[PDB]
Amino acid sequence: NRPEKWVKGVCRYCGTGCGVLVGVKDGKAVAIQGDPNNHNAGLLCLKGSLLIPVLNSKERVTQPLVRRHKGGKLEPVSWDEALDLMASRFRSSIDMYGPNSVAWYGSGQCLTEESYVANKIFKGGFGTNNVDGNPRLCMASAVGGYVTSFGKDEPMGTYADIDQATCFFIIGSNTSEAHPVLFRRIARRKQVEPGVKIIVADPRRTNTSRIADMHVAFRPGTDLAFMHSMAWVIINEELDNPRFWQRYVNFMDAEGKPSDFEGYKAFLENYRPEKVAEICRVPVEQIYGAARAFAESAATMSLWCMGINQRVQGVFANNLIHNLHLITGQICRPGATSFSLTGQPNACGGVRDGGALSHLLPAGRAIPNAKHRAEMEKLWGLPEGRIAPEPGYHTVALFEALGRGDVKCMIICETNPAHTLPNLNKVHKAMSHPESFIVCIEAFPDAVTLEYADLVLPPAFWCERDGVYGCGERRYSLTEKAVDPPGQCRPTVNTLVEFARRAGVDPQLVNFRNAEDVWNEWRMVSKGTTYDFWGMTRERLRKESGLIWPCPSEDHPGTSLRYVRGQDPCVPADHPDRFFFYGKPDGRAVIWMRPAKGAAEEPDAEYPLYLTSMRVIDHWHTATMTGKVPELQKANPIAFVEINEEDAARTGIKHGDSVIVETRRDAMELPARVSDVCRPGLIAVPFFDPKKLVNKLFLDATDPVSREPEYKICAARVRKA
Ligand SMILES: Nc1nc2c(c(=O)[nH]1)N[C@H]1C(S)=C(S)[C@@H](COP(=O)(O)OP(=O)(O)OC[C@H]3O[C@@H](n4cnc5c(=O)[nH]c(N)nc54)[C@H](O)[C@@H]3O)O[C@H]1N2
Ligand SMILES: Nc1nc2c(c(=O)[nH]1)N[C@H]1C(S)=C(S)[C@@H](COP(=O)(O)OP(=O)(O)OC[C@H]3O[C@@H](n4cnc5c(=O)[nH]c(N)nc54)[C@H](O)[C@@H]3O)O[C@H]1N2
Ligand code: SF4
Ligand SMILES: [O-][Cl+3]([O-])([O-])[O-]
Ligand SMILES: [O-][Cl+3]([O-])([O-])[O-]
Ligand SMILES: [O-][Cl+3]([O-])([O-])[O-]
Ligand SMILES: [O-][Cl+3]([O-])([O-])[O-]
Ligand SMILES: [Mo]
Question: Superkingdom of this entry's organism?
Answer without folding.
Answer: Bacteria
